[PDB]
């Protein structure tokens, strides 16, 4: 749980002690982790006598070092109860021609089914009985990690299609604000497909409120550095 304090916007300076001004603060993350972040606006919203924070936080994720993925994630469809089959060879365009040591990490296995990796880039996904929804599982083609997402109808019509979760994401509805202590809490999810060394940026726009219901905006950054060993 990262804990950050906001700059009070008091014409008070900061970030200068040591060379390389990186004002937007840093956050270390590991591929696969799911952490929690708390930011204390009490330094900025307490002098502004009013009704504290509101649930109007908005986020943006933009990467300054993406390191394009060697492989590409894939999608599939099947009905309920029926076994699903798939291949894992057309998802790795290789430049120089080498072997293919396929692997399914059991740390990142399926959630409502079982997977049988075949002899050569083939896999059998048997969904659990009496289950309909979406499922994901993360393969490692020659170390390069990708995901395969299976949709499982209740064998009647069809399903929509999920948005192929990004390397760095923020959950849709897991944010909270405590107006009694001026703290905003949210979750930071790191995909297992994130490549070590990459650097992303999260911009947070959070608004307070006065005694009459007007608005007072605040904007900040955080540089998420996806590294190994957390």
């Amino acid at each position: 749980m990262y804990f950050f304090s906001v700059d009070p916007r008091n014409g008070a300076s900061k970030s200068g002690d040591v060379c390389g001004s990186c004002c937007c603060e840093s956050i270390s993350a590991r591929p696969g982790e799911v952490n929690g972040v708390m930011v204390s606006y009490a330094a900025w919203s307490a002098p502004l006598r009013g009704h504290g924070l509101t649930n109007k936080t908005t986020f943006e994720i933009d990467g300054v070092s993406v390191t394009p993925p060697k492989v590409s994630n894939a999608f599939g469809r099947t009905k309920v109860g029926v076994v699903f089959e798939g291949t894992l060879s057309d998802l790795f365009p290789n430049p120089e021609g080498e072997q293919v040591e396929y692997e399914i990490s059991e740390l990142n296995g399926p959630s409502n089914g079982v997977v049988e990796l075949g002899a050569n880039g083939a896999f059998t996904y048997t969904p659990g009985a009496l289950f309909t929804g979406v499922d994901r599982f993360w393969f490692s083609i020659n170390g390069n990690i990708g995901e395969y997402v299976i949709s499982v109808d209740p064998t009647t019509s069809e399903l929509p299609q999920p948005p192929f979760t990004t390397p760095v994401y923020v959950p849709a509805a897991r944010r909270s604000v405590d107006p009694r202590t001026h703290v905003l809490k949210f979750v930071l999810g790191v995909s297992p497909a994130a490549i070590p060394g990459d650097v992303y940026r999260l911009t947070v726009r959070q608004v307070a409120i006065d005694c009459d219901g007007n608005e007072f905006v605040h904007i900040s950054c955080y540089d998420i550095s996806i590294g190994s060993c957390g």
Binding site: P196, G227, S228, C229
Partner: protein, 48 residues
């Protein structure tokens, strides 16, 4: 550090040219002798 028992035949074209010398040195190897380092170049995660 000069190797006593070598007696290599002298020439003009040495071997690894300056660029290759830098490559070897920085990367590692102990191209002759000079630069008696051990090829490390990295660490657990951070290179320097």
């Amino acid at each position: 550090g000069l190797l006593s028992c070598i007696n290599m035949p002298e020439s003009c074209t040495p071997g690894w040219t300056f660029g290759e010398v830098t490559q070897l040195q920085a990367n590692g190897f102990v191209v002759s002798i000079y630069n008696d380092v051990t090829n490390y170049l990295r660490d657990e995660k951070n290179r320097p």
